[PDB]
Structures are given as structure tokens and as C-alpha cells.
Curated annotation (Swiss-Prot):
Function: Nuclear receptor that exhibits a ligand-dependent transcriptional activation activity. Binds preferentially to double-stranded oligonucleotide direct repeats having the consensus half-site sequence 5'-AGGTCA-3' and 4-nt spacing (DR-4). Regulates cholesterol uptake through MYLIP-dependent ubiquitination of LDLR, VLDLR and LRP8; DLDLR and LRP8. Interplays functionally with RORA for the regulation of genes involved in liver metabolism. Induces LPCAT3-dependent phospholipid remodeling in endoplasmic reticulum (ER) membranes of hepatocytes, driving SREBF1 processing and lipogenesis.
UniProt-recorded name of the protein: Oxysterols receptor LXR-beta
Family (UniProt): Belongs to the nuclear hormone receptor family. NR1 subfamily.
Summary of the tissues where the protein is detected: Ubiquitous.
UniProt source species: Homo sapiens (Human)
Location of the region described as Transactivation AF-2 in the Swiss-Prot/TrEMBL record: 2-232
Chain's gene name: NR1H2
Amino acid sequence: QLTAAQELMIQQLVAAQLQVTPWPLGADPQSRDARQQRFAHFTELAIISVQEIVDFAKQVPGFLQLGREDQIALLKASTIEIMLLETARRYNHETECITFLKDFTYSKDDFHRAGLQVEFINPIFEFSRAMRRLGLDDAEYALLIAINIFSADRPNVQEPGRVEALQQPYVEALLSYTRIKRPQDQLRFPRMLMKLVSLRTLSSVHSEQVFALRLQDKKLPPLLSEIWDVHE
Ligand SMILES: O=S(=O)(c1ccccc1)N(CC(F)(F)F)c1ccc(C(O)(C(F)(F)F)C(F)(F)F)cc1
């Protein structure tokens, strides 16, 4: 059984988890102004997602207690990973679209029309598609978000032992939650760890998608820019 202390951390997380420039209508796909406006749209969707991800972290017990520079380094690393996680949650398997809202849905071709490469769009859609077979519930997603944020090995983490100590009760809760929910499915927890590793691959591919877009003269807005640009 889950201990009281685990049922409490899950509930806080779930409760905490409860808490634009228009697509260019009928513009040519080859059109450069249209490709810029599609990019700017996604960019603005993405800005609302870091906002909500930063507001969610502030509510994870311990996070605000951490070094200001560690907060930022933890948020820097995991933003794209958490966005990817959420995209998967919201994927419409009938329609083959990542949904942001409800009338805001995007196919592979939508992303291509914004100047993105198949090298990035294909693996994001495959990850979304493969997440349904895992059948995660609210609590499992939330636990996974919290463990993703408390990753001791991110670039520029100055207090990794503190970060790991904060992670452990969440990994431990997740383990026991999976054993309770699916006693017969002993591959479930390792599958969850496998997604974490996928997220680090897709975070890396996202980074080079951002770089290539710079070579096409497409610049991220300041807020996203400080998260994702490389510069020497
Ligand atoms: O799901 S996203 O976060 C997303 C962003 C905006 C609108 C809808 C969905 N996303 C796809 C992913 F699967 F990776 F999560 C996404 C994130 C970031 C980007 C970009 O960084 C930018 F600039 F558009 F925001 C880029 F296009 F450069 F890759 C594009 C798509």
C-alpha cells in the first residue's frame, strides 16, 4: 500500500497540476511571410507553456527552497521535456494531431509549414503515439513531472545531492504506485524510465532544430531564446 506520506505528495502534485498571433488563413505553404507567422504562432503557444511549467514548479515542495541558480538550471533542462510529456498527454490518436487547446490542433504538416524538419517532427509524433500504450494516469504524469524536474545531473546544477534527495521520495512513490495499480505489469516502471531517456534524446533534437532555424534566420523571442539558443 501507499504510505500516508506518499498519498500526500501525489495529491499536492495532482491539485497543483489542476492549478495569440493567428494562423495565416489560406496562405501558400511555400510562402515565407506565412512560414514566419506559423513559427511566431508556435512560439507564442510555447511561451504559455513555460509560464504554466514555471508556475507548477514553484508549487513542488522544496523547489523554492533551492538555490536560485539551481531553480533556473533545473527549469532550463526540463522545460522542453515537460512540454513534450504534456503534448503526449493531449495527443488525439484519431486525428493524428497534437492538441494545445481544443480548436488549436496541429498535424505533422502544420509543423512542416512553420519551417520545421521531419527529423524533429517525426520523433515528437512517435513519442506522443507511443505514450498511449503506457496508459499513464494523472498521478503518474504528475509524479513523472516532479522526478523530471529534480534531475541531479543537469548542466550547471550546483547542489546535486540536494536535488537527488528531493527526487528520491517521488521515484519511490511512483515505483509503489505502479506496483499497486498494475501488479502483473513488472515492465511498467522500466517503461517509465525509458520515456525519461527518450525525453533527453528529444530535448537534444529540439536544440538542433532551434539552431537550424537560426540558420534560416528564424529567431526565438527573448524568453524562449535564453532557454534554448546555444551561442559561444
Ligand atoms: O508541444 S510543443 O511544446 C508545442 C509548442 C507550441 C505549440 C504546440 C505545441 N512542441 C512540440 C513538442 F512535441 F516538442 F513538445 C514544440 C516546442 C518547441 C518548439 C520550438 O522551440 C518553437 F520555437 F516553436 F517554440 C521549435 F519550433 F523551435 F522547435 C516547437 C514545438
